[PDB]
Design a protein around this ligand. Structure first.
Ligand SMILES: Nc1nc2c(ncn2[C@@H]2O[C@H](COP(=O)(O)OP(=O)(O)OP(=O)(O)O)[C@@H](O)[C@H]2O)c(=O)[nH]1
Ligand SMILES: Nc1ncnc2c1ncn2[C@@H]1O[C@H](COP(=O)(O)OP(=O)(O)OP(=O)(O)O)C[C@H]1O
Ligand SMILES: [Mg+2]
Ligand SMILES: [Zn+2]
Ligand SMILES: [Zn+2]
Lengths: 199, 50, 343, 49, 148, 348, 65, 197, 103
RNA sequence: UGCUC
């Protein structure tokens, strides 16, 4: 009886998959035949074949879903900061405090190459910088680390160690990733959407 | 099997083959092994240059 | 202590209940601090030895002590593949009416070993299908099955009704070429077993064919493999952590091979001891008894390999081992000559 | 249903558009009673390796 | 001398979570001179240990006592007077994390150095004054010698 | 003049599986001629094609135009399509016999001598890797015995040579991570890599598989380009098999047999469940049974019986997992996530 | 169809021990003791001789003759 | 007369259909203490997801049978139990679980884990690579629509179905799609009048 | 044309060398690996197979100091040849004395 | 129709 019930379940699954194959095949055919006309133009506006605009900007922001590092987000600031700290450790430079970190961030972000970047990404960068600066402040207040750089135990500076070089590297890497993660004009976005919804 | 679906949207082409696959981890991910028998049939037109 | 553990790791291979440990060769310079494992020809020649324990026709068993697993495996693989022998390669068929397929018949004939000495022949050059007197041998096989003129009325058994209905390999006749008849005496060139059943015929059917055999190595095709089973195993050495006596001694005797553990009455009570760890095959049946797990310690000697070579009968196994070592030396000499020519 | 093996004792005289035969077919070692009932051991379609 | 730290520890537990690994064990040890706790992965197959064992442990920047920090490459075949001659169990690792203690919400003075000897984890936790000289991305030598 | 040359090495060739669900079902690869009669490719690319090497026939097309060749190589390049456009997750990653191999390699029990370590490192020095230095990493334990851990051997794949600018960094959780160790888990399931050196954790499907983000190959692709990730994947595919074969990994009937305590627990659980089911049946048939909200009494009994059976199932599975000893091939393959899971083990 | 000459796994000559094996079946010997007397220690040759079916005579019964 | 090669499909009487991936020499195959080398090496990763314990039971029963010269029965809802075959294995001096001590043939060193050896009844299927291998040159075309034929027996070429066109569109390779569906398949040059169309 | 040498890069560094050997297999590769690994002047020694289809192997040798990594190769070859000669002589003597004592 | 996947 147990073997018969197991065979029943197996055949049920088999027929389910058999119906699913054809059903999803038809659905994919329809979705692709309907969405094969859209394309990303050079002015960041998704337009149909007749010239009508479907979206003034793809996804509201204009980022490539294939180049999405985070969960529906362009970058994971924590991972990028850790990678920058690990790849470029500067032992000959002192650590930065909250005020110094905020000052260098505001001075670097106001450059020309950062003007063309979207405002939301800059606001997210500012929020992450403020968060890490508050964390550094809390750490230094817990361990009484002085911003002057004359504390006797230097190992205390290794808890949250940040140098302006690492800050600049992090900002440049984030900007480059955000610029290279945008929708490249000419891509058949409609067909990609149809396939990603059909599969 | 109509003309739109059978002869315009999807149609048969030449210079193509169909064969069974087998594993081979000694090749790169961007590389594929082709048998000598099929390689001698599928030809590529190269233009004589300097 | 730590020294005992290091010694057990570098000398013994322990087999656990779930997995084997200390399986990698580590006796190399730089791996051990208190040991100078640098290569020394004197120590190798001193510690190395070979002792033959059994040697009969087409069967040899010998223990090599001092050699490493690498050279042991090299010798094994050379014997398996890189030892050349003679085997049927080309088959010329003349009106084969047998039910057995021509290709299947040629394949079966290719697997039949030949007693010819391969050292007296040479490899056939590329092509040259005609073959020369130096690098080929010819075997004619002509069998015509017919009804027995004198047989019983019923004669239900095929033996009485028909004659030559089973084409054994003894019907193969070696046809000398050139001066092979003078060099090889009569009876030397012949099938090894002389009893291999090639095919079965019926009256009216006839098998007439010629077989050209040339020299070849086992790597090209398995039909040239001289050794039927050439393998080696590490010498077991069973040790008892604590003296086991009583009916547990009989349990031990029943767990391992019947010929490795022996029970003796030294003071009227049965006590078990290792008699001959050679016969043990490490069935790992002692792990079933819960109490007798922590009383034994199965291990294999790293520098003691028992080689067992059972051949197909082309030539004795000692000459096979000699030719394997000679082929390895020839490869080494060829590579040395190539290197010298490079520089 | 697509296994390769012998068809019958008259497979040599039989001439079909497509036939597959095995050189050295061997009967299974773990054979079910149904195999003995259908006499499949007499016409095996595989080898024990 | 490149000795960054040196202290005698006593083991208080061998496997608090059970016998996970056959060759490696997670020893927990406490120091006598200071309140330095050590959670160290040790290879018991080659260097066996017990519960009541007391051993001297030294974390140094270089393996040579003369102060030569030329550690570009290590040649096991080279024989020369080194610090390892005075110890029994020598490992080579890198101090890959320095984390401040989070249990004390305020007025915290305890830190912890996590070192990875080829995967073997070693957390040395205690007062920051004893961890002087420890820096991230710094390769060091651990030397353990059992005492009577 | 035009010469119809044979298909030689270096020619871009389209390779596709007839049933296509997404665009990654067809990719442009580089053709290499081989004497056999089958299409062979790296198994790490099986997930996009969804192939299983069980008799599937795949199609191979040869473009007849230089422009088409260049477009196929650039847009449909295997190195340029390591991620799907659906959610950006990497599809071209490790697969069975590569996740288990890397897992067993990076286990804390692995300790290799100089000979075995050098052999495993040379196992990948083929092709373009023949013009680079080995860079043998220093040994971990050197005084008692010079032993190279398997994690260093695995990291050598990330940074084989000195001049290689690959500096991989990752910090994530494994499948069997407890949730409190924070890089000190008793199971050592917290993956931590710094400067292309495996500092902590064991590799599994969560880090080498094609499941989701946080994959080492994904980080390499997003940090150092496509070529570095492709080279790392090739090195892994060339190293893991050699070590897995030299070590030995097999499954037998003894790896799935139940223990005495397991049988006792199963018997007790079955007795308890049958007793509770009989009690519920008696309560419903004779008397008033507590009716669950949003359903009738019969559906309430159905739900209660299903709950009791699921309790029996999960308790038997937990008992079997607790009684099973380490080094068990099914348990290892379920832990590393290569193939199977705990449910299949409990069922079988 | 017919007993193979060589064993698949090892390669020991087993074709010459077929008819003799049949003789052991004509005698009172069982399968195990017969295979043991023939000198087949490893189980590969035991499987080769035991799992083999003799179909050559059944085909010869259909041969032209 | 065809010999098994790379691409030939093989079954093991348990639905574990597989294709020959590689043919390694005999010297490369691992060997046990008795010197037996395996003919077929299968992937164990197929057991957990498929739970084919029946294959392991069949292998153990076959090993016991070939050791004691018997034919065990795998009858459904019955047959020889595991205990009987384990007793038969331990009586003949072999392991009671099939796993045996094996030495690596390549490196010559013993394996850390025991290998599960035993006789399994493998059956070869009619699906061969030689019959399925296909390659199409220019070749002939159909009269109605000048395109390659369909079947291999008819010397037909492969079909770039609608899904292949969808994938090529998603990739954006316009020139590749044009060369496939226009240049290399049904290219032609017609004459159109610019006045009447 | 059987055994060919290759430098680690275009700089022609004699410290790291690669010997590509033709018509060989794991036998001689492993034998020479074991015989040359015992040379104290060898940092890294490793043999590999390019592809099972073609019959060729690639050995790689990196020494400690300024050794050309070619002299260790000849050293290992000569040591292997000497070991082969010694084991051959020992086996011949063993077989001879066994035949003598058997009769 | 049978199949293969
Ligand atoms: N043997 C065989 N039977 C077929 C074939 N095509 C169809 N049939 C059988 O005929 C029935 C369906 O007929 P169709 O396939 O519709 O025939 P059709 O396509 O209208 O015929 P044509 O237009 O001449 O191709 C099925 O029940 C099949 O068993 C074929 O190619 N071979
Ligand atoms: N009708 C079909 N349409 C599309 N693809 C198919 C069809 N039939 C088979 N395939 C191909 O075969 C694959 C189906 O295998 P899958 O269902 O995943 O395993 P399976 O056949 O259930 O094997 P198990 O029974 O799990 O051992 C996926 C698909 O590419
Ligand atoms: Mg499939
Ligand atoms: Zn055999
Ligand atoms: Zn007109």
């Amino acid at each position: 009886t147990e073997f018969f019930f197991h065979t029943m379940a197996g055949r049920e699954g088999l027929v389910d998959t058999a119906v699913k194959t054809a059903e999803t095949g038809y659905m994919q055919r329809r979705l692709v035949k309907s969405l094969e006309d859209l394309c990303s133009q050079y002015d960041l506006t998704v337009r149909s074949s007749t010239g009508d605009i479907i979206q003034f900007i793809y996804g509201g922001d204009g980022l490539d879903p294939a180049a999405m590092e985070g969960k529906d987000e362009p970058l994971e600031f924590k991972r990028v900061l850790d990678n920058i700290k690990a790849v470029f450790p500067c032992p000959s430079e002192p650590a930065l405090s909250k005020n110094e970190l905020i000052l260098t961030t505001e001075s670097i972000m106001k450059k020309s190459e950062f003007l063309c970047c979207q405002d939301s990404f800059l606001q997210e960068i500012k929020k992450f910088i403020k968060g890490v600066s508050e964390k550094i402040k809390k750490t230094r207040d817990k361990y009484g680390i002085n911003d002057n750089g004359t504390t006797e135990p230097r190992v205390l500076y290794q808890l949250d160690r940040i140098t302006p070089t690492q800050v600049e590297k992090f900002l440049e890497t984030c900007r480059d990733k955000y610029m290279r993660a945008q929708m490249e004009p000419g891509s058949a976005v409609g067909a990609l959407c149809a396939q990603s919804i059909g599969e | 099997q109509g003309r739109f679906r059978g002869n315009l949207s999807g149609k048969r082409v030449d210079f193509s083959g169909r064969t069974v696959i087998s594993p081979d981890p000694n090749l790169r991910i961007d590389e594929v092994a082709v048998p000598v028998h099929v390689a001698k049939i599928l030809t590529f037109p190269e233009k004589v240059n300097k | 202590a730590a020294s005992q553990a290091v010694e057990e790791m570098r000398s013994r291979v322990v087999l656990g209940e779930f997995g084997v440990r200390n399986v990698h060769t580590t006796d190399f310079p730089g791996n051990y601090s208190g040991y100078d494992d640098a290569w020394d020809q004197d120590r190798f020649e001193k510690n190395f030895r070979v002792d033959v324990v059994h040697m009969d026709e087409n069967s040899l068993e010998f223990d090599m002590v001092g050699i490493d697993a690498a050279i042991a495996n090299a010798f094994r693989r050379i014997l398996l593949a890189e030892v050349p022998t003679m085997a049927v390669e080309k088959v010329l068929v003349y009106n084969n009416t047998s039910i057995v397929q021509d290709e299947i018949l040629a394949h079966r004939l290719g697997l039949i070993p030949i007693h010819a000495d391969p050292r007296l022949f040479e490899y056939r050059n590329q092509g040259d299908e005609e073959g020369t007197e130096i690098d080929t041998l010819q075997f004619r096989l002509q069998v015509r099955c017919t009804r027995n003129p004198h047989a019983a009325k019923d004669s239900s058994d095929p033996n009485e009704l028909y004659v030559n209905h089973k084409v054994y390999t003894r019907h193969m006749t070696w046809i000398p070429l050139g001066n092979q008849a003078d060099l090889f005496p009569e009876g030397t060139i012949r099938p090894v077993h002389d009893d291999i059943l090639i095919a079965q015929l019926r009256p009216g059917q006839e098998i007439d064919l010629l077989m050209h055999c040339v020299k070849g190595i086992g790597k090209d095709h398995a039909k040239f493999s001289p050794v039927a089973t050439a393998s080696y195993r590490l010498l077991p050495d069973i040790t008892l952590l604590e003296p086991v006596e009583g009916e547990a001694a009989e349990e031990l005797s029943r767990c391992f091979s019947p010929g490795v553990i022996e029970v003796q009455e030294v003071q009227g009570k049965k006590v078990a001891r290792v008699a001959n760890p050679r016969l043990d095959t490490f069935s790992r049946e002692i792990f079933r008894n819960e109490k007798l797990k922590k009383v034994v310690r199965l291990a294999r000697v790293r520098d003691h390999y028992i080689f067992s070579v059972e051949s197909t009968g082309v030539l004795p196994p000692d000459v096979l081992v000699s030719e394997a070592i000679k082929v390895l030396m020839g490869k080494c000499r060829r590579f040395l000559d190539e290197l010298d020519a490079v520089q | 249903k697509q296994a390769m093996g012998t068809i019958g004792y008259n497979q040599r005289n039989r001439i079909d558009t497509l036939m597959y035969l095995l050189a050295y077919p061997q009967k299974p070692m773990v054979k079910t009673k149904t195999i003995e009932l259908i006499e499949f051991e007499k016409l095996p379609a595989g080898q024990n390796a | 001398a490149g000795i960054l730290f040196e202290d005698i520890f006593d083991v208080k537990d061998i496997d608090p979570e059970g016998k996970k690994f056959d060759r490696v064990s997670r020893l927990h040890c406490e120091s006598e001179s200071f309140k330095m706790d050590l959670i160290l992965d040790v290879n018991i197959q080659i260097y066996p240990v017990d519960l009541g064992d007391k051993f001297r442990l030294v974390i140094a920047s270089t393996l040579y006592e003369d102060g030569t920090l030329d550690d570009g490459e290590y040649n096991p075949t080279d024989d020369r007077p080194s610090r390892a001659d005075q110890f029994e169990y020598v490992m080579y690792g890198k101090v890959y994390r320095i984390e401040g203690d989070e249990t004390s919400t305020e007025a915290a003075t305890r830190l912890s150095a996590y070192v990875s000897y080829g995967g073997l984890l070693m957390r040395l936790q205690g007062d920051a004054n004893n961890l002087h000289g420890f820096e991230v991305d710094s390769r060091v030598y651990l030397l353990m010698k059992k005492l009577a | 003049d035009i010469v119809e040359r044979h298909l030689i090495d270096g020619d871009v060739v389209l390779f596709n599986r007839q049933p296509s669900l997404h665009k990654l079902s067809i990719m442009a690869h580089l053709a290499r001629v081989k004497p056999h009669r089958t299409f062979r490719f790296n198994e790490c690319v099986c997930t996009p094609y969804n192939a299983d090497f069980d008799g599937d026939e795949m199609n191979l097309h040869l473009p007849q135009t230089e422009e088409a060749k260049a477009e196929a190589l650039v847009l449909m390049g295997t190195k340029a399509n390591l991620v799907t456009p659906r959610n950006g997750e990497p599809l071209i990653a490790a697969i069975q016999d590569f996740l288990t191999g890397a897992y067993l390699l990076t286990l804390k029990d692995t300790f290799f001598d100089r000979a075995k370590a050098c052999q495993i490192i040379a196992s990948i020095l083929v092709g373009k890797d023949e013009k680079i230095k080995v860079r043998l990493p220093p040994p971990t334990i050197l005084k008692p015995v010079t032993l190279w851990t398997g994690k260093q051997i695995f990291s050598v794949i990330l940074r084989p040579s000195d001049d290689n600018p690959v500096r991989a960094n990752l910090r994530t959780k494994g499948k069997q991570y407890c949730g409190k160790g924070e890089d000190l888990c008793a199971n050592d399931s917290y993956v931590t890599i710094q400067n292309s050196e495996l500092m902590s954790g064991s590799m599994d499907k969560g880090t080498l598989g094609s499941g989701s983000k946080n994959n080492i190959f994904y980080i390499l692709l997003r940090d150092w380009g496509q070529n570095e990730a492709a080279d790392a994947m090739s090195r892994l595919a060339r190293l893991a098999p050699v070590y897995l074969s030299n070590r030995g990994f097999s499954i037998g009937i003894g790896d799935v047999t139940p223990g005495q305590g397991l049988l006792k627990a199963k018997y007790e659980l079955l007795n308890a469940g049958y007793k509770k089911c009989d009690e519920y049946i008696e309560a419903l048939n004779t008397g008033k049974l507590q009716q669950q909200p949003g359903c009738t009494a019969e559906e309430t009994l159905e739900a209660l019986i299903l709950k009791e059976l699921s309790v029996i199932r999960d308790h038997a599975g937990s008992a079997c997992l607790r009684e099973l000893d380490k080094s068990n091939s099914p348990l290892t393959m379920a832990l590393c996530g290569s193939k199977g899971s705990f449910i299949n083990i409990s069922q079988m | 169809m017919i007993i193979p000459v060589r064993c698949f796994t090892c390669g020991k000559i087993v074709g010459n021990k077929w008819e003799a094996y049949l003789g052991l079946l004509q005698a009172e010997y069982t399968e195990g003791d017969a295979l043991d007397a023939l000198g087949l220690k490893r189980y590969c040759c035991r499987r080769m001789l035991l799992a083999h079916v003799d179909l050559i005579e059944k085909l010869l019964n259909y041969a032209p003759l | 007369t065809r010999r098994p090669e790379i691409g030939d499909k093989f079954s093991s009487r348990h639905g574990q259909k597989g294709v020959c991936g590689l043919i390694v020499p005999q010297e490369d195959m691992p060997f046990c203490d008795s010197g037996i080398c395996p003919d077929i090496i299968m992937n164990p990763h197929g057991f957990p997801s498929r739970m084919t314990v029946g294959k392991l039971i069949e292998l153990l029963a076959g090993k016991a049978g070939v050791l004691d010269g018997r034919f065990h029965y795998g009858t459904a809802f019955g047959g020889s139990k595991v205990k009987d075959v384990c007793e038969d294995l331990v009586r003949h001096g072999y392991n009671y679980l099939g796993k045996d001590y094996v030495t690596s043939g390549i490196t010559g060193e013993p394996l850390e884990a025991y290998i599960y050896f035993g006789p399994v009844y493998y059956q070869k299927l009619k699906h061969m690579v030689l019959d399925k291998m296909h390659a199409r040159a220019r070749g002939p075309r159909a009269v109605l629509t000048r395109q390659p034929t369909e079947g291999r027996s008819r010397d037909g070429g492969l079909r770039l179905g609608e899904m292949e066109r969808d994938c090529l569109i998603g990739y954006g390779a316009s020139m590749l799609l044009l060369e496939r569906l226009m240049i290399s398949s049904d290219a032609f040059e017609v004459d159109v009048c610019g006045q009447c169309g | 044309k059987t055994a060919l040498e290759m430098v680690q890069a275009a700089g022609t560094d004699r410290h790291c060398v690669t010997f590509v050997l033709h018509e060989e297999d794991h036998t001689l590769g492993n034998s020479l690996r074991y015989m040359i690994m015992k040379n104290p002047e060898v940092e890294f020694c490793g043999y590999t197979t390019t592809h099972p289809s073609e019959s060729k192997i690639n050995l790689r040798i990196q020494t400690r100091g300024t050794l050309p990594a070619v002299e260790p190769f000849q050293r290992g070859l000569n040591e292997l040849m000497n070991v082969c000669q010694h084991v051959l002589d020992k086996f011949e003597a063993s077989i001879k004395d066994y035949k003598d004592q058997k009769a």
